[PDB]
Write an enzyme that holds these catalytic residues in place. Structure first.
Site, PDB file in Angstrom:
ATOM      1  N   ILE A  15      20.574  38.772  47.203  1.00  0.00           N
ATOM      2  CA  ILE A  15      19.911  39.703  48.121  1.00  0.00           C
ATOM      3  C   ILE A  15      18.658  39.017  48.655  1.00  0.00           C
ATOM      4  CG2 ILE A  15      18.540  41.860  48.275  1.00  0.00           C
ATOM      5  CD1 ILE A  15      20.487  43.167  46.378  1.00  0.00           C
ATOM      6  N   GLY A  16      17.877  38.429  47.756  1.00  0.00           N
ATOM      7  CA  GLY A  16      16.661  37.736  48.151  1.00  0.00           C
ATOM      8  C   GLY A  16      15.872  37.195  46.983  1.00  0.00           C
ATOM      9  N   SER A  17      14.683  36.660  47.281  1.00  0.00           N
ATOM     10  CA  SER A  17      13.762  36.102  46.297  1.00  0.00           C
ATOM     11  C   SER A  17      12.544  36.996  46.197  1.00  0.00           C
ATOM     12  CB  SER A  17      13.335  34.691  46.692  1.00  0.00           C
ATOM     13  OG  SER A  17      14.285  33.723  46.283  1.00  0.00           O
ATOM     14  N   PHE A  20       8.830  37.062  40.995  1.00  0.00           N
ATOM     15  CA  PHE A  20       9.196  36.469  39.714  1.00  0.00           C
ATOM     16  C   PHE A  20      10.626  35.968  39.553  1.00  0.00           C
ATOM     17  CE2 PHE A  20       5.779  39.733  39.061  1.00  0.00           C
ATOM     18  CZ  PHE A  20       4.721  38.849  39.150  1.00  0.00           C
ATOM     19  N   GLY A  21      11.392  35.992  40.628  1.00  0.00           N
ATOM     20  CA  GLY A  21      12.746  35.480  40.551  1.00  0.00           C
ATOM     21  C   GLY A  21      13.657  36.065  41.596  1.00  0.00           C
ATOM     22  N   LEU A  22      14.936  35.781  41.437  1.00  0.00           N
ATOM     23  CA  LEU A  22      16.005  36.167  42.342  1.00  0.00           C
ATOM     24  C   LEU A  22      16.415  37.605  42.167  1.00  0.00           C
ATOM     25  CD1 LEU A  22      16.354  33.255  43.343  1.00  0.00           C
ATOM     26  CD2 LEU A  22      18.678  33.302  42.541  1.00  0.00           C
ATOM     27  N   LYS A  37      17.422  42.036  39.097  1.00  0.00           N
ATOM     28  CA  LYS A  37      16.272  41.161  39.326  1.00  0.00           C
ATOM     29  C   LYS A  37      16.143  40.252  38.115  1.00  0.00           C
ATOM     30  CE  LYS A  37      13.499  44.399  42.090  1.00  0.00           C
ATOM     31  NZ  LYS A  37      12.132  44.980  42.212  1.00  0.00           N
ATOM     32  N   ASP A 128       0.126  50.190  41.819  1.00  0.00           N
ATOM     33  CA  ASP A 128       0.257  49.324  42.978  1.00  0.00           C
ATOM     34  C   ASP A 128       1.186  49.936  44.022  1.00  0.00           C
ATOM     35  OD1 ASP A 128      -0.215  46.981  44.509  1.00  0.00           O
ATOM     36  OD2 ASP A 128       1.377  45.850  43.493  1.00  0.00           O
TER      37      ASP A 128
HETATM   38  N1  ADP Z   1      16.728  48.126  44.117  1.00  0.00           N
HETATM   39  C1  ADP Z   1      16.951  47.272  45.126  1.00  0.00           C
HETATM   40  N2  ADP Z   1      18.016  47.487  45.937  1.00  0.00           N
HETATM   41  C2  ADP Z   1      18.196  46.685  47.000  1.00  0.00           C
HETATM   42  N3  ADP Z   1      17.453  45.647  47.406  1.00  0.00           N
HETATM   43  C3  ADP Z   1      16.410  45.448  46.569  1.00  0.00           C
HETATM   44  C4  ADP Z   1      16.098  46.192  45.441  1.00  0.00           C
HETATM   45  N4  ADP Z   1      14.963  45.690  44.821  1.00  0.00           N
HETATM   46  C5  ADP Z   1      14.617  44.677  45.576  1.00  0.00           C
HETATM   47  N5  ADP Z   1      15.440  44.475  46.655  1.00  0.00           N
HETATM   48  C6  ADP Z   1      15.275  43.433  47.673  1.00  0.00           C
HETATM   49  O1  ADP Z   1      15.006  42.210  47.011  1.00  0.00           O
HETATM   50  C7  ADP Z   1      14.073  41.414  47.777  1.00  0.00           C
HETATM   51  C8  ADP Z   1      12.915  40.988  46.908  1.00  0.00           C
HETATM   52  O2  ADP Z   1      12.486  42.129  46.139  1.00  0.00           O
HETATM   53  P1  ADP Z   1      11.136  42.419  45.340  1.00  0.00           P
HETATM   54  O3  ADP Z   1      11.668  42.194  43.922  1.00  0.00           O
HETATM   55  O4  ADP Z   1      10.526  43.722  45.667  1.00  0.00           O
HETATM   56  O5  ADP Z   1      10.312  41.092  45.526  1.00  0.00           O
HETATM   57  P2  ADP Z   1       8.711  41.061  45.486  1.00  0.00           P
HETATM   58  O6  ADP Z   1       8.386  41.726  44.120  1.00  0.00           O
HETATM   59  O7  ADP Z   1       8.087  39.726  45.679  1.00  0.00           O
HETATM   60  O8  ADP Z   1       8.357  42.058  46.597  1.00  0.00           O
HETATM   61  C9  ADP Z   1      13.729  42.222  49.027  1.00  0.00           C
HETATM   62  O9  ADP Z   1      14.474  41.738  50.143  1.00  0.00           O
HETATM   63  C10 ADP Z   1      14.102  43.658  48.633  1.00  0.00           C
HETATM   64  O10 ADP Z   1      14.515  44.424  49.757  1.00  0.00           O
END
Ligand code: ADP
Ligand code: QWS
Length: 263
Positions: A15-17, A20-22, A37, A128
């Protein structure tokens, strides 16, 4: 139990980065599709976190992203969340800028306010709250996520009020001065989130450093009214930004006030 065995998870797509990780889209055996996560070793106090799991698993509300469990057989550990199809609210606002009706923006604030009124009643402090920590689901529902997580983050640059990466832009004066967290400091953060929503994802105080934000807030300056916010909505934002926590409304009061405005 909140412990998920590695054999109960399958990773399908990245999905993305994150910080703290993928983050992956995956499936959780006999349950549902999930967002997983992966947490880099050293990023969080995993032992402190696991201690609160039995209690925190009881939190459940339609406007809170559910954290189902933790996969911890080996490092790096995984946190397994409810999948939110449209991703984070900050990105969602920015990508759809110019397509939002004012009623939809107020509706997004109401979803967040409802989730926060549940956490306030539960005596859970977010610490936060910001649009980046809200997620967008089916039929554009907004849900709050990541409440309480800063109590486990091990990077002092983010958690110390005197730290270089501290989220000062969403911090009430007693948080940026003393780390005095309460549901009333979350109300201040909620006012900044309302500003992010009505500004369609603009970053607050983009033209100021952290120390300049502290000086500006301490001298009474506040964020300007976004074009899409009515004067009544901006009045509620300003109530969230009262200097004294005791003078800010509780989320229970904000929810009734914003609902009266919407309905
Ligand atoms: N519960 C979730 N369902 C779908 N996408 C998610 C979810 N949690 C995070 N994402 C996606 O994962 C990516 C990174 O998430 P996030 O963990 O919030 O990173 P950071 O903590 O640096 O903001 C983003 O593109 C976010 O939309
Ligand atoms: C498996 C979960 C319930 O374990 C924990 C353990 C410690 C926690 C400490 C603070 C906050 C937690 N927390 C965070 C949650 N959700 C999101 N989206 O962040 C939830 C939940 N019940 O949905 N609980 C915690 C959740």
């Amino acid at each position: 139990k909140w412990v998920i065995d590695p054999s109960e998870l399958t990773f399908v797509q990245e999905i993305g980065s994150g910080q703290f990780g993928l983050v992956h889209l995956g499936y959780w055996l006999n349950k549902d599709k999930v967002a997983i996560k992966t947490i880099r070793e050293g990023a969080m106090s995993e032992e402190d976190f696991i201690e609160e799991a039995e209690v925190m698993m009881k939190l459940s509300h339609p406007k809170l992203v559910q954290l189902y469990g933790v996969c911890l057989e080996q490092a790096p550990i995984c946190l397994v969340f409810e999948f939110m199809e449209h991703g984070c609210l900050s990105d969602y606002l920015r990508t759809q800028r110019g397509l939002f009706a004012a009623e939809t923006l107020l509706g997004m604030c109401l979803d967040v306010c409802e989730g926060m009124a549940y956490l306030e009643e539960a005596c859970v402090i977010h610490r936060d709250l910001a649009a980046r920590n809200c997620l967008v689901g089916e039929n554009q529902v907004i849900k709050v996520s990541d409440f309480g997580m800063t109590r486990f983050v091990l990077d002092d640059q983010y958690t110390s009020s005197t730290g270089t990466k501290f989220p000062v832009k969403w911090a009430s004066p007693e948080v940026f001065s003393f780390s005095r967290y309460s549901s009333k400091s979350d109300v201040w953060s909620f006012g900044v989130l309302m500003w992010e929503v009505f500004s369609e994802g603009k970053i607050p105080y983009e033209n100021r450093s952290n120390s300049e934000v502290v000086e500006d807030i301490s001298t009474g300056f506040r964020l300007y009214k976004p074009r899409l916010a009515s004067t009544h909505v901006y009045q509620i934002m300003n109530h969230c930004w009262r200097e004294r926590p005791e003078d800010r409304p509780a989320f229970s009061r904000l929810l009734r006030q914003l609902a009266e405005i919407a309905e």
